[PDB]
Amino acid sequence: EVETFAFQAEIAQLMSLIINTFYSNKEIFLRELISNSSDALDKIRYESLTDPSKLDSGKELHINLIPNKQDRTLTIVDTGIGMTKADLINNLGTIAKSGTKAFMEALQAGADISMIGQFGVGFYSAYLVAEKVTVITKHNDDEQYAWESSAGGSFTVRTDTGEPMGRGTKVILHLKEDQTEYLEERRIKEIVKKHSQFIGYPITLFVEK
Numbered sequence: 001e002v003e004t005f006a007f008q009a010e011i012a013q014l015m016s017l018i019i020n021t022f023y024s025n026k027e028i029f030l031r032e033l034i035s036n037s038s039d040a041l042d043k044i045r046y047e048s049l050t051d052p053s054k055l056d057s058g059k060e061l062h063i064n065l066i067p068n069k070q071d072r073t074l075t076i077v078d079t080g081i082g083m084t085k086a087d088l089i090n091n092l093g094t095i096a097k098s099g100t101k102a103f104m105e106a107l108q109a110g111a112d113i114s115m116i117g118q119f120g121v122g123f124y125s126a127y128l129v130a131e132k133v134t135v136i137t138k139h140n141d142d143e144q145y146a147w148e149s150s151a152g153g154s155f156t157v158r159t160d161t162g163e164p165m166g167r168g169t170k171v172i173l174h175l176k177e178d179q180t181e182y183l184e185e186r187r188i189k190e191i192v193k194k195h196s197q198f199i200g201y202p203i204t205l206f207v208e209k
């Protein structure tokens with residue numbers, strides 16, 4: 001059972017800008033998604049400070065980067081707090097409407113796309129490199145769900161019957177044909193060292209057969 005939703009108009013406009021604007025510095029998508037993972041890990045860690053049982057769904061707090069050249073996907077996995085179904089529908093737990101408003105004023109007032117994270121909508125920088133994004137998520141207070149969008153004004157949400165995740169979020173980037181450099185080990189390592197050197201969780205870059 002798949003539910004299809006329309007993006008709010010401001011979010012659709014944000015994704016069309018990210019997709020259509022000529023902007024060569026696409027690598028910041030990875031910094032933005034890792035920083036989102038770090039924020040989600042901070043949240044479950046804080047909650048566990050007063051309720052250890054919050055970590056019954058997984059004690060390890062980490063970030064994995066999994067490239068797959070056969071599928072042409074880059075997956076960013078974290079064991080953070082995750083998202084409820086309501087969170088997924090409400091712009092993946094962001095205040096995306098007011099965030100978009102600010103970001104697009106900043107853009108007309110000098111800023112560039114790389115600053116998207118300062119407006120709380122860094123998730124959508126995934127569409128710099130991905131034609132389709134799938135988000136699998138599990139929050140302690142809800143079931144496992146899969147969100148998906150190829151932009152175009154709509155997204156879907158369904159119960160995920162795939163591999164149980166325990167707790168956290170998995171962002172699966174179905175990369176554009178000309179963006180496969182972000183599956184190469186040496187290019188991912190470069191980006192992580194350049195932009196994510198101070199993330200306080202272990203970031204493991206998986207290698208391929």
Ligand SMILES: O=C(Nc1ccc(F)c(F)c1)C1CCC1
Nearest residue numbers: 017018019021104107108113116
């Ligand atoms: O708004 C613009 N681009 C834009 C905005 C948000 C984005 F996430 C993005 F990738 C590109 C134009 C350059 C200023 C006018």
